[PDB]
Amino acid sequence: MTPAVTTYKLVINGKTLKGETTTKAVDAETAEKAFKQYANDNGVDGVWTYDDATKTFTVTE
């Protein structure tokens, strides 16, 4: 079987970068690493939440 994958969302409230993006992953930790890399690649340094009910991460500066 292929692994079950989930779509995770990132809500970004940055100083210059704003909006939403998505990633697909087998688990939340994998998604978190992809989103933290995305934020670092775009110069975002903020604080984070994760809601397991909605599969949504949020970062604010």
Side-chain angles (χ1 to χ4, degrees):
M1 66 173 258
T2 59
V5 297
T6 301
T7 303
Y8 294 86
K9 179 172 281 171
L10 178 64
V11 174
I12 306 138
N13 293 313
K15 285 179 184 154
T16 66
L17 177 62
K18 303 172 179 165
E20 295 185 350
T21 189
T22 67
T23 201
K24 290 190 169 193
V26 294
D27 61 34
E29 178 186 12
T30 303
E32 185 181 299
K33 288 178 186 164
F35 289 147
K36 286 202 168 161
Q37 186 71 56
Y38 166 90
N40 188 259
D41 291 347
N42 288 292
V44 173
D45 186 15
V47 297
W48 292 73
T49 63
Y50 175 64
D51 188 351
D52 198 48
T54 65
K55 309 299 175 188
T56 300
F57 295 84
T58 308
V59 61
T60 187
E61 294 186 298

